[PDB]
Ligand binder design. Structure first.
Ligand SMILES: *[C@@H]1O[C@H](CO)[C@@H](O)[C@H](O)[C@H]1NC(C)=O
Ligand SMILES: *[C@@H]1O[C@H](CO)[C@@H](O)[C@H](O)[C@H]1NC(C)=O
Lengths: 345, 199
């Protein structure tokens, strides 16, 4: 039981006696423990970095190494200690997620300029029979997230799920111009009444490249402490007004976070919004930005680095009075994916 | 009383009587013995007495000031549309028939996740604290030099009934945005009075 945390990526460690997650001090850690630690949370042939950092997480029962014993596992050699012997703790990056080219005026949800290429380098587009339908966001070269109600019945088998990345326009994704299918996991509790758990992972067989237009988005950490009116940046080719078809180019302007007690009150949405559903938009008149993509994500920028918080979901009439969009809640189950990404290899 | 400092913010200088700070005015603060003093307390707006504003209940010596002063157009009608509202089930409001030319309140029967005819109109919950300020007809305005407060705010969901959709009236609890206090201090009802020495 091991997990990332917060902005500076401290490994928390669960112990059965202390019943609690705990950090590890950097007393003689190695890439032969560290680069072999990303396969613990579903990263087989990738690694980025590890360093020592200052303790600020908030536990007073650390984890230490049993290097005095012989050749045992990592998971046996972890006892408790009250002090870090070098006062450096786990810092980690399991993949080259994060940065884009910090550009200026990408605002093409209605009334703006187009999404500049390479500045949203995780934006994909998913296709069946070469029509543009749903979006998503990459976290590994082999895994890809999207909204589950695209992969619902009777289209629930993987061989008709063709991903197509890269090109802002509706045309240039051709056959061969985009890697293709594999495994369709789902959170297996989607419903008709609630759309609780409208998030399904997808998998590819052929690992793509981090070249220019493609880069994995950062999946959030357990307990990363958002702000209750935070800015959020969505993207997608969606139709800016309803009863349309699709916008031609990539549109990537901004929205805001509404809290629960405004959405979940009596006038907006009469007590519907679950813990695995996050509201977003602006609770206002016709100022909202629709661009309906059903997976066209919600990307915030805390710790000066882009992080993923919500993938899209259902809504009401396109960007109008009282009716915001309601988003899937992808900090709730960032470990369920990490126990459904552990055993593909 | 401290609203009345010459060139200030507050309630009285913003939504009752804006003391102009340009002319050669001179302000007087005087008193009056309360043997025979009958404070008239009348509402100055047309479109509140058009929709059944009768009076305030205050005491014998309480003066009704204002907090917010909302302005509507000429075709305003604070009742819902009764020939639309019958097929609503959820959040269904009261309504009546508007007088002639006064356009109806905009009420939708838009679709939930399962329920199809659930009511959603504008001006919720009250226009003091509406969620969508760019859509309720009662626009909040600040009063000017030598104007009256153009109308108390109407809560849009106490104006009407169910069976007899008569001419659209309202109900005395629904006018909101006013408070008061007593003028009497030192056994003498204090009074402000401005002067303007023009030309
Ligand atoms: C009050 O009214 C009575 C009769 O209306 C009058 O005789 C009296 O002079 C008034 N009070 C004062 C202080 O003038
Ligand atoms: C004000 O007047 C109304 C009607 O006369 C009455 O119902 C109400 O009780 C009065 N207010 C007080 C505080 O008694």
């Amino acid at each position: 039981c091991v997990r990332l945390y917060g902005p500076n990526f401290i490994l928390q460690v669960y112990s059965s006696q202390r019943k609690s997650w705990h950090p590890v001090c950097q007393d003689d850690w190695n890439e032969n423990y560290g680069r072999a630690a990303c396969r613990d949370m579903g990263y087989k042939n990738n690694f980025y970095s590890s360093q020592g950092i200052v303790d600020d997480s908030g536990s007073t029962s650390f984890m230490k190494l049993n290097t005095s014993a012989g050749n045992v596992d990592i998971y046996k050699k972890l006892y408790h200690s009250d002090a870090c012997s070098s006062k450096a703790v786990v810092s980690l990056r399991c993949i080259a997620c994060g940065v884009n080219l910090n550009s200026s005026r990408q605002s093409q949800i209605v009334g703006g300029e187009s999404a500049l290429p390479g500045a949203w380098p995780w934006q994909v587009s998913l296709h069946v029979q070469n029509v543009h339908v749903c979006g998503g966001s990459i976290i590994t070269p082999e895994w890809i997230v999207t909204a589950a109600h695209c992969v619902e019945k009777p289209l629930n088998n993987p061989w008709h799920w063709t991903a197509f990345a890269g090109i802002l326009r509706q045309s240039f994704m051709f056959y061969g111009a985009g890697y293709q299918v594999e495994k369709v996991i789902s959170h297996p509790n989607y419903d008709s009444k609630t759309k609780n758990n409208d998030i399904a992972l997808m998998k590819l067989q052929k690992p793509l490249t981090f070249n220019d237009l493609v880069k994995p988005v950062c999946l959030p950490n357990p307990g990363m402490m958002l702000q209750p009116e935070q800015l959020c940046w969505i993207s997608g080719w969606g139709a800016t007004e309803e009863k349309g078809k699709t916008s031609e180019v990539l549109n990537a302007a901004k929205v805001l976070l509404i809290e629960t007690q405004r959405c979940n009150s009596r006038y907006v949405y009469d007590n519907l919004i679950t813990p695995a559903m996050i509201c977003a938009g602006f609770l206002q008149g016709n100022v909202d930005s629709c661009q309906g993509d059903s997976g066209g994500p919600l990307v915030t920028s805390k710790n000066n680095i882009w992080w993923l918080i919500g993938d899209t979901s259902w809504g009401s009439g396109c960007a109008k009075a009282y009716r915001p969009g309601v988003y899937g809640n992808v900090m709730v189950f960032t470990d369920w994916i990490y126990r459904q990404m552990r055993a593909d290899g | 009383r401290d609203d009345l400092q010459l060139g200030s913010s507050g309630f009285l200088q913003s939504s009752n009587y804006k003391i102009d700070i340009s002319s050669s005015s001179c302000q007087l603060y005087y008193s009056l013995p309360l043997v025979n003093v009958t404070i008239n307390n009348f509402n100055p707006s047309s479109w509140n007495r058009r929709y059944g504003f009768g009076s305030f209940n205050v005491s014998s010596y309480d003066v009704v000031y204002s907090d917010h002063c909302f302005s509507v157009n000429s075709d305003f009608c604070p009742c819902a549309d009764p020939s639309v509202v019958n097929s609503c089930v959820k959040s269904k409001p009261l309504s009546a028939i508007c007088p002639a030319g006064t356009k109806y309140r905009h009420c939708d029967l838009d679709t939930t996740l399962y329920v199809n005819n659930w009511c959603r109109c504008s001006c919720l919950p009250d226009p003091i604290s509406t969620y969508s300020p760019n859509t309720c007809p009662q626009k909040k305005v600040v009063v000017g030099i030598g104007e009256h407060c153009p109308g108390l705010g109407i809560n849009e969901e106490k104006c009407g009934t169910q069976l007899n959709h008569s001419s659209c009236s309202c109900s005395p609890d629904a006018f909101l945005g006013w408070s008061f206090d007593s003028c009497i201090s030192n056994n003498r009802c204090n009074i402000f009075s401005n002067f303007i020495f023009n030309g």
